[PDB]
């Protein structure tokens, strides 16, 4: 089940949600939260509709009339004529799947290196080697917020995270960084959060 992206909502509307169907190789190619890009064909699917208003019956074209005691009236006649309601839903049949915004042009560092192209890999390498990368990342990630350099640095470290670990007895050592911002109103806290999300 997918729903329309926020970039396409009309005014005052609720996003339209439709079910798309993946077949064969693509069966598990979409995961929750992903901004996928389904390519395929729209289709209709017969529906067992609960509409109490009759509509669009389909029946035989052979003119047959029940004899006395077996008249084509009621459920008997409906069944004999083969009357069925033509109620449909719109469903999407996706042959291929792919993210809307590709990140690159199990998981491991070598896997990421291979997945990313030569230009992207060289850019990553050169920025990794670049000096003052800490300040560069902070500034490039928060180009509108002034001050709060400590908050910027903390959020960057949170984004990079730690190294989760598990002890011999089983107890786990959390490696994720938790950050909280407390302060006076209009101090850019929501701005930091929205930067992080976007």
């Amino acid at each position: 089940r997918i729903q329309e992206t926020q970039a396409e909502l009309p005014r005052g509307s609720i996003p339209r949600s439709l079910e798309v169907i993946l077949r064969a190789e693509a069966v598990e190619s979409a995961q929750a939260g992903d901004k996928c890009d389904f390519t395929g064909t729209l289709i209709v699917v017969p529906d067992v509709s609960k509409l109490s208003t009759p509509g669009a019956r389909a029946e035989t074209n052979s003119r047959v009339s029940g004899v006395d005691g077996y008249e084509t009236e009621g459920i008997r006649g409906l069944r004999a004529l083969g009357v069925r309601d033509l109620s449909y839903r719109l469903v999407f049949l996706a042959c291929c799947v792919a993210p809307t915004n590709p990140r690159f042009g199990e998981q491991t560092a070598e896997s990421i290196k291979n997945q990313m192209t030569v230009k992207e890999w060289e850019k990553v390498f050169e920025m990794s080697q670049d000096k003052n990368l800490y300040h560069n990342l902070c500034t490039s990630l928060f180009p509108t917020i002034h001050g709060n350099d400590e908050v910027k640095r903390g959020v960057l470290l949170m984004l990079f995270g730690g190294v989760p670990k598990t002890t011999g007895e089983g107890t786990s050592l959390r490696g994720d960084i938790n950050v909280c911002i407390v302060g006076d109103p209009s101090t850019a806290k929501s701005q930091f959060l929205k930067h992080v999300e976007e």
Binding site: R11, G12, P46, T53, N61, I75, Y88, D184, P185
Partner: protein
């Protein structure tokens, strides 16, 4: 006809018998319409009808001398859209009997009008190509002031009502031409819909195998459809009658044309249909239900402002009107003129009216996506903090009745879920659906919150997200999303004890958290000065109401401003704004006053941009920023309050 395919008209329902009956001329059975006479009358109406009272502003691109709808047909030739909106009022004026026949027999008459328009159009143009034959939309039928007064005698007739859209269901596909294929020889046949049903071939036409033909759902042909839950605005409101919700149905071109919260005059056929006892049995109920097969949507209203769609449309103003509005802008006191025009019968609230006008005009929409900053609120928010009986409720109601996409809530009558969204069981599909709230229905308009202090924080918390990021992030059990709520909030608050103590400071009297008050980019203290002249003139005005600029120009000015005015900060205005914010913060550092945070610099930018838009400058200027300063300062009575006490 020129070989064009005559598309079906699902709005007109399933075609009927169409039995011709001779009265001895050759009427349709059960009616008094003869196709030849109706077609000739409508052809005459098209060929030669001129509006004597028509105004150049009422009709744009239309000469009041040449016949009206021939120019419309010329437009339909120029563009591809094969639709012709015909005014039932014009039909009534031209041929009254034709109007009565149209209103009483829409399904029969309207196809004759379609035939006539197609004949005339394809006679005039032997080469113009259209996807389908032109279709006639009769609107402006004599308004039905209340659906509750319509009677079974009116069923299947063309009525017109008015109301705001509460909900618009998903696109429902409808069968029009079934496709059948043989399970033996693969012989293909098509069966068009006939009187609301389809006849299965039951025998192959090639191999003669009985019942070898199977229906191919996705090779058949379908047409769009959409349920629309609309709330009626009955002009005639009898005592003890609650508001009314009426089911509409759009068909194949009106699907997804009116969003929830939009106010529209809907002209359409008033249908009555049976109710099945169960969704699985065919037994129906003796009592039918009624709905509206919509023929035409009309957005334009006389007592409201131009809607978003009308503003977007290019040909909304004649060149003469554009020049007139530009002259009115070059006029030096346009700001005060428009402020006075707003709420003409509210006595000398000049500053509040100016603020409300700036709210209506709104700032500039900004695309900060590339900056990773978020979405900036261009809307302006106003809070009228005043003693009960200071006309704040009157101003709220005036704005509510003036603005399109306006919602109104008061005090403890609202809830967080009811304002944001919720889940109900649509009692026509028996399916669980999601219904919006006031803050969403007013997405691109205004929400008026009266009694803004009796708003127990459980629901007042919702306003933070709406007023900060124009978004309403709902994460409920099943549905997760963020709804656009780009509203403008006009709120009314009463000081604690329902009376303004002249000893407690501004904040101590307002009693609203600074976190919230900093969101409102305008706060007006409606306080009563015990003044002889004010009391005397107010009494004169109030008594004058007991015995005795144009809305048109105001509406057109606002529409043009929104259409093509996008003020941009100039360098001088930028420096002025910087100095304004520093001075305002310095002043607001006082103990009890309303302190100023960078949200107030944002507010000053918003107000300056709104004033520039009012001036049609397209460039925000030091004049605009100074006016924003003055307005924000006179509001809250900063000049009249010392930096220590109130």
């Amino acid at each position: 006809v020129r070989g064009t395919p005559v598309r079906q008209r699902p709005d007109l329902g399933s075609a009927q018998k169409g039995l011709q009956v001779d009265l001895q001329k050759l009427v349709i059975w059960g009616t008094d319409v003869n196709v030849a006479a109706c077609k000739e009358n409508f052809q005459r109406f098209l060929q030669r009808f001129i509006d004597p009272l028509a105004k150049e502003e009422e009709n744009v691109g239309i000469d009041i001398t040449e016949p009206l709808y021939m120019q419309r047909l010329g437009e339909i030739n120029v563009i591809g859209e094969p639709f012709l909106n015909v005014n039932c009022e014009h039909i009534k004026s031209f041929d009254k009997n034709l109007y009565r026949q149209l209103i009483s027999y829409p399904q029969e008459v309207i196809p004759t009008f379609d035939m006539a328009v197609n004949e005339i159009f394809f006679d005039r143009y032997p080469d113009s190509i259209l996807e389908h034959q032109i279709q006639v939309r009769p609107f402006n039928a004599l308004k039905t002031k209340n659906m509750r007064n319509l009677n079974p005698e009116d069923i299947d007739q063309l009525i017109t009502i008015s109301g705001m859209v509460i909900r618009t269901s998903q696109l429902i596909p409808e069968m029009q031409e079934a496709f059948f294929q043989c399970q033996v020889c693969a012989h293909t046949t098509r069966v068009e819909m006939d009187r609301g049903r389809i006849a299965e071939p039951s025998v192959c036409g090639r191999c003669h195998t009985t019942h070898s033909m199977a229906l191919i759902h996705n090779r058949s042909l379908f047409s769009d459809k959409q349920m629309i839950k609309l709330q009626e605005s009955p002009e005639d409101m009898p005592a003890g009658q609650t508001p009314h919700t009426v089911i509409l149905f759009a068909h194949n071109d009106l699907v997804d044309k009116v969003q929830p919260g939009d106010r529209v005059n809907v002209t359409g056929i008033y249908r009555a249909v049976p109710i099945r006892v169960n969704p699985r049995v065919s037994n129906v109920k003796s009592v039918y239900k009624t709905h509206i097969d919509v023929i035409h949507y009309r957005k334009t209203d006389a007592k409201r402002l131009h809607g978003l769609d009308e503003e977007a449309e290019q040909k909304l103003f004649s060149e003469k009107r554009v020049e007139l509005l530009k002259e009115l802008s070059r006029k030096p006191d346009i700001y005060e003129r428009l402020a006075s025009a707003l709420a003409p019968s509210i006595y000398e609230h000049e500053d509040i009216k100016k603020g409300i006008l700036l709210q209506l005009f709104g700032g500039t929409r900004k695309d900060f996506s590339h900056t990773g900053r978020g979405k900036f609120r261009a809307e302006i928010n106003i809070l009228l903090c005043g003693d009960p009986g200071t006309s704040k409720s009157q101003l709220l109601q005036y704005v509510y009745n003036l603005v399109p996409r306006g919602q109104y809530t008061s005090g403890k009558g609202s809830s967080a879920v009811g304002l944001t969204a919720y889940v109900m069981k649509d009692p026509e599909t028996r399916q669980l659906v999601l219904q919006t709230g006031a803050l969403v229905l007013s997405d691109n308009g205004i929400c008026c919150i009266d009694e803004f202090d009796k708003m127990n924080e459980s629901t007042r918390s919702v306003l933070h997200e709406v007023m900060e990021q124009q978004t309403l992030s709902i994460a409920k059990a099943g549905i997760i999303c963020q709804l656009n709520a780009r509203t403008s909030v006009l709120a009314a608050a009463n000081p604690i004890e329902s009376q303004w103590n002249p000893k407690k400071t501004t904040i101590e009297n307002i009693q609203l958290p600074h976190t919230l008050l900093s969101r409102f980019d305008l706060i007006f203290l409606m306080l009563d000065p015990q003044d002889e002249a004010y009391d005397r003139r107010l009494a004169h005005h109030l008594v004058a109401l007991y015995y005795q600029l144009d809305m048109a120009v105001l509406k057109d000015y606002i529409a043009y401003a929104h259409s093509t005015i996008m003020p941009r900060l100039s360098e001088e205005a930028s420096q002025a704004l910087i100095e304004a914010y520093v001075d305002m913060r310095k002043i607001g550092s006082s103990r009890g006053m309303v302190s100023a945070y960078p949200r107030q610099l944002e507010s000053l930018i918003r107000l300056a941009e709104a004033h520039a838009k009012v001036r049609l400058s397209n460039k925000v200027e030091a004049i605009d920023v100074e006016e924003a300063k003055r307005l924000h300062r006179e509001a809250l009575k900063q000049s009249a309050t010392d930096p220590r006490t109130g």
